[PDB]
Ligand binder design. Structure first.
Ligand SMILES: *[C@@H]1O[C@H](CO)[C@@H](O)[C@H](O)[C@H]1NC(C)=O
Ligand SMILES: *[C@@H]1O[C@H](CO)[C@@H](O)[C@H](O)[C@H]1NC(C)=O
Lengths: 50, 30
């Protein structure tokens, strides 16, 4: 539940409660309706939910 | 893609207070 323009500004030193800030500058960032996903690429085919 | 009766049912039942809930209370999506 966070617009994903907050975590890129969160990319700093000692400016975020979670320590693993290194992962914020990770992989492709996807926008969902429940937040934003970091580290997962969005294909556009269909499968059975896992 | 809904029919007439589904549209009526959706219109009849209605769902700043959510913004007021800054006190660590959230609603997850289905
Ligand atoms: C975040 O807010 C901006 C407003 O400038 C909007 O354009 C964007 O779609 C929003 N994205 C998410 C993931 O909430
Ligand atoms: C799926 O994503 C690829 C990414 O390059 C794009 O080329 C393709 O047009 C997309 N297909 C649909 C149906 O959106």
């Amino acid at each position: 539940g966070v617009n994903c323009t907050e975590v890129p500004v969160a990319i700093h030193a000692d400016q975020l409660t979670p320590t693993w800030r290194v992962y914020s500058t990770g992989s492709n960032v996807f926008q969902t309706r429940a937040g934003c996903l970091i580290g997962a690429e969005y294909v556009n085919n269909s499968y059975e939910c896992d | 893609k809904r029919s007439f009766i589904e549209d009526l049912l959706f219109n009849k039942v209605t769902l700043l207070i959510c913004a007021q809930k800054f006190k660590g209370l959230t609603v997850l999506p289905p």
